[PDB]
Design a protein around this ligand. Structure first.
Ligand SMILES: Cc1ncc(CO)c(CN)c1O
Length: 388
């Protein structure tokens, strides 16, 4: 039987990713609510997240398969509560780094949220039940942003009370996380009867190239998903004009989900398609970041974020569909854990070079040209593959 754990897990997802303060965070921490300058949020505060998503990845995943997936989801709920309490009632550059630390632990426990399904659902309904739950998170986000923007452009509700709605939502998410069914078996440690198995893990080359491209694409997308709000703030300030970040980010998540659904029905020969369409949409992403660095009208930057998130979600759903062909249940999660680790090492190196203060200390103007060049180098590796 699988109805009730699916219901409790989907309620946790739909009230966990229902954060209306998530689009309007950079007009919040740069407005009169918290006196933090843009250089501080760009260079001294946000990179901590990437740091706190590397160091907190490898233990938490091992805490994921050891205490059977429940106290790490309860830890995600407590992390939600502490993070949005510190966003509501924290002032100073000390506190916002602590916000980024607990939110890195949130994003680390997100994989533990997506890995809960394979412990209480029977192996008949692995594809169906998970096929609902992830969609619920997107359904929590898009409408979760619309309830943001339709409460800002129509009611003049404060950003503080937008964060208050976020805190109440993650509190409901934590109260649904307390009534979770404690499962019985894990996937690796408490599985019913791996150093020497590693050659058995990586006895391929197709997995290697799709995993390396997944790693670079995930690092680039996480960096752009960090700093696109600071780019939106720099192209048009929040105090000057009534910016529409919630509606654009909701439409962007919607277009990404529809693009992934379109990837799910591609009846094209893969050896005939993947040599061209991958390169074409990589050039589309590179041109999107080139557009967001070059322009001055903020509407061109909104269109750039729309096209970038949609084309990325297309390419990364192609990546997941290629990687998940021959893998088992354990192989899928193990290989994606190691690839997420490689992606966060690459993202941490690129953040230490570019974004962070003791480094190049580049502002948000130079950064998006650097990330357009990053996706262009990925497309150049694909072009050299097209020579091969
Ligand atoms: C809480 C939080 N902090 C920082 C960032 C990076 O801008 C994000 C965006 N994922 C976020 O949700």
């Amino acid at each position: 039987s699988w109805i009730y754990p699916t219901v409790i897990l989907c309620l946790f997802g739909f009230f966990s990713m229902m954060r209306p303060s998530e689009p309007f965070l950079i007009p919040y921490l740069s407005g009169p609510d918290k006196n933090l300058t843009s250089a501080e949020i760009t260079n001294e505060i946000f990179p901590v997240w990437t740091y706190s998503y590397l160091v907190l990845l490898l233990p938490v995943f091992v805490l994921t398969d050891y205490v059977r997936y429940k106290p790490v989801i309860i830890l995600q709920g407590i992390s939600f509560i502490i993070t949005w309490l510190l966003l509501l009632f924290g002032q100073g550059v000390k506190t916002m780094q602590v916000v980024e630390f607990f939110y890195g632990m949130v994003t680390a426990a997100e994989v533990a949220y997506y890995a809960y399904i394979y412990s209480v659902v029977s192996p008949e309904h692995y594809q169906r039940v998970s096929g609902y739950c992830r969609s619920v998170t997107l359904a929590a986000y898009t409408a979760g942003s619309v309830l943001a923007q339709l409460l800002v452009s129509l009611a003049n509700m404060s950003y503080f009370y937008l964060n208050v709605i976020s805190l109440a939502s993650v509190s409901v998410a934590f109260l649904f996380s307390l009534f979770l069914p404690m499962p019985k078996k894990s996937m690796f440690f408490h599985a019913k009867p791996w150093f020497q198995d590693l050659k058995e893990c990586y006895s391929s080359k197709r997995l290697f190239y799709w995993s390396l491209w997944w790693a670079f694409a995930t690092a680039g997308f996480n960096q752009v998903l960090n700093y696109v709000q600071i780019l939106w703030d720099y192209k048009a300030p929040s105090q000057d004009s009534s910016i529409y970040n919630g509606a654009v980010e909701a439409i962007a998540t919607f277009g990404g989900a529809v693009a992934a659904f379109a990837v799910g029905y591609v009846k094209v020969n893969w050896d005939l398609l993947g040599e061209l369409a991958l390169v074409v949409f990589s050039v589309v992403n590179a041109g999107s970041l080139f557009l967001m660095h070059y322009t001055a009208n903020i509407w061109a930057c909104y269109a750039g974020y729309l096209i970038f998130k949609s084309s990325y979600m297309l390419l990364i759903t192609i990546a997941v569909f290629q990687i998940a062909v021959n893998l088992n249940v354990e192989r899928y999660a193990l290989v994606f854990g190691i690839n997420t680790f490689i992606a966060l090492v690459i993202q941490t190196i690129m953040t230490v070079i570019v974004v962070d203060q003791r480094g190049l200390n580049l502002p948000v103007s130079i950064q998006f040209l650097v990330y357009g060049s990053y996706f262009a180098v990925i497309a150049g590796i694909f072009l050299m593959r097209s020579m091969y």
